[PDB]
Amino acid sequence: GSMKKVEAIIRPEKLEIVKKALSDAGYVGMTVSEVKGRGVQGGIVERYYIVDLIPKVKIELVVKEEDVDNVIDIICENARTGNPGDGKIFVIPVERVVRVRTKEEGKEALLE
Amino acid sequence: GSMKKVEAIIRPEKLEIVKKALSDAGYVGMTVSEVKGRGVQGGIVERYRGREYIVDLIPKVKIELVVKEEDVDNVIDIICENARTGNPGDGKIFVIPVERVVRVRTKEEGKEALLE
Amino acid sequence: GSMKKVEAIIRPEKLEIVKKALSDAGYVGMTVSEVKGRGVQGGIVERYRGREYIVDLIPKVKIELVVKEEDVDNVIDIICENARTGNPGDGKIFVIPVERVVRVRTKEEGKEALLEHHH
Numbered sequence: 001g002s003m004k005k006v007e008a009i010i011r012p013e014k015l016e017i018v019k020k021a022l023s024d025a026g027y028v029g030m031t032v033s034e035v036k037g038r039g040v041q042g043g044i045v046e047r048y049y050i051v052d053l054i055p056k057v058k059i060e061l062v063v064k065e066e067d068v069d070n071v072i073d074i075i076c077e078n079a080r081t082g083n084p085g086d087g088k089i090f091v092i093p094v095e096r097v098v099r100v101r102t103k104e105e106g107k108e109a110l111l112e
Numbered sequence: 113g114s115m116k117k118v119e120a121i122i123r124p125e126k127l128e129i130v131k132k133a134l135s136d137a138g139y140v141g142m143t144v145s146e147v148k149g150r151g152v153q154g155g156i157v158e159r160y161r162g163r164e165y166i167v168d169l170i171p172k173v174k175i176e177l178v179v180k181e182e183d184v185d186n187v188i189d190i191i192c193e194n195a196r197t198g199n200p201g202d203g204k205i206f207v208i209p210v211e212r213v214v215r216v217r218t219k220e221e222g223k224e225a226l227l228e
Numbered sequence: 229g230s231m232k233k234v235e236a237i238i239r240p241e242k243l244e245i246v247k248k249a250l251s252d253a254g255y256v257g258m259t260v261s262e263v264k265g266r267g268v269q270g271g272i273v274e275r276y277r278g279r280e281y282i283v284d285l286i287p288k289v290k291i292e293l294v295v296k297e298e299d300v301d302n303v304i305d306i307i308c309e310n311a312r313t314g315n316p317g318d319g320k321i322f323v324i325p326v327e328r329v330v331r332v333r334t335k336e337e338g339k340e341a342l343l344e345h346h347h
């Protein structure tokens with residue numbers, strides 16, 4: 001079946017708990033990027049300079065389509081705080097997956 | 113589909129004006145990354161902070177904005193107008209489909225997820 | 229007609245080799261990002277106060293090349309040939325659809341925005 005990239009932008013302080021909850025559920029493979037974001041959360045002020053772009057973490061996990069709902073649930077449960085700035089998750093289609101070492105493709109390419 | 117990811121690679125010195133332009137036009141949510149790149153070969157050699165980069169990767173900034181598909185033309189026009197200089201290396205923009213958008217806090221999806 | 233983004237996550241020490249190989253084959257346009265990756269191995273172990281702890285994220289490099297669909301296989305082949313080592317952690321390549329490409333300087337779109345200039 002099809003594969004999807006789940007791209008989540010979360011608070012950096014939530015990375016370890018989200019990563020662990022994903023791993024616990026069997027989603028071990030992931031790529032993490034340091035980014036900056038702005039949104040309705042607003043910038044860090046001083047006083048009374050603004051820092052409009054604040055540190056965030058991007059997690060990217062390519063998974064089978066059937067697993068997207070569960071990945072989303074895990075990220076939301078573990079990344080949320082109830083305050084503005086908790087982030088967003090984007091699901092992007094992935095048409096092909098290749099393992100560099102072996103040139104395996106498809107579901108094989110995400111399996112040991 | 114309804115939503116799209118605009119991935120714009122621009123000059124680092126254009127981040128502030130492009131971000132301001134976008135915010136002033138009502139686009140506040142964006143994610144910004146530091147990257148390096150090259151464009152196509154040939155033509156005038158790219159210069160960065162005074163030096164010619166004949167072969168090395170050149171510092172750029174990536175801005176990712178997920179927006180409704182109806183807003184893509186506007187976003188692209190705002191970025192290009194405010195990012196361009198007329199010299200090679202001004203940038204490139206890719207539009208990528210986004211099938212789903214979810215707000216972490218509420219689990220709201222779709223167009224609500226990008227709003228308010 | 230269509231465009232694709234080839235996104236490869238490779239070992240940092242293979243970036244220069246992969247970049248050169250791609251450029252030698254005419255694929256010069258690319259965007260490179262430092263990232264951290266978690267792989268299905270390992271590894272890696274640290275001890276503190278009588279306890280082994282594992283460190284799961286390690287540095288990687290992301291390369292993104294937007295190309296015509298007809299070139300995707302060639303790009304994949306070049307990356308695999310030049311990024312591989314035979315050990316766990318050599319990386320993954322993902323191909324993602326791109327619906328529009330725009331060159332900022334000129335507003336040129338599509339194939340035109342990926343086309344070489346005169347040497």
Ligand SMILES: Nc1ncnc2c1ncn2[C@@H]1O[C@H](COP(=O)(O)OP(=O)(O)OP(=O)(O)O)[C@@H](O)[C@H]1O
Binds near residue numbers: 009086178179
């Ligand atoms: N439309 C978007 N496109 C790209 N990135 C976005 C977008 N919206 C939000 N982001 C990223 O997500 C981060 C959090 O966004 P925001 O501050 O708007 O809070 P939210 O959690 O998205 O919504 P709320 O604050 O209402 O819970 C931003 O800093 C940015 O990195």
Ligand SMILES: Nc1ncnc2c1ncn2[C@@H]1O[C@H](COP(=O)(O)OP(=O)(O)OP(=O)(O)O)[C@@H](O)[C@H]1O
Binds near residue numbers: 122149202203
């Ligand atoms: N095909 C591509 N794939 C991925 N990234 C690209 C591609 N082309 C350009 N980029 C990214 O966009 C940045 C800017 O490219 P650049 O402005 O040099 O494009 P160009 O097509 O050569 O146009 P110009 O003639 O205006 O320089 C690059 O440094 C790189 O980060």
Ligand SMILES: Nc1ncnc2c1ncn2[C@@H]1O[C@H](COP(=O)(O)OP(=O)(O)OP(=O)(O)O)[C@@H](O)[C@H]1O
Binds near residue numbers: 264315
């Ligand atoms: N499902 C995934 N989604 C996103 N990124 C991934 C995924 N799986 C792996 N990666 C990225 O690719 C890198 C390589 O992963 P991993 O070591 O699991 O695969 P491998 O390189 O194929 O190893 P092996 O060849 O031994 O299976 C990781 O560090 C991570 O950056």
Ligand SMILES: O=C(O)CCC(=O)C(=O)O
Binds near residue numbers: 163166167168
């Ligand atoms: O890398 C630099 O500092 C200058 C660019 C350069 O040496 C080159 O690619 O020609």
Ligand SMILES: [Cl-]
Binds near residue numbers: 119176
């Ligand atoms: Cl991206």
Ligand SMILES: [Cl-]
Binds near residue numbers: 198
């Ligand atoms: Cl020009």
Ligand SMILES: [Cl-]
Binds near residue numbers: 092208324
């Ligand atoms: Cl993407």
Ligand SMILES: [Cl-]
Binds near residue numbers: 101102314315
């Ligand atoms: Cl092998």
Ligand SMILES: [Mg+2]
Binds near residue numbers: 151200
């Ligand atoms: Mg160029």
Ligand code: NA
Binds near residue numbers: 244
């Ligand atoms: Na280089």
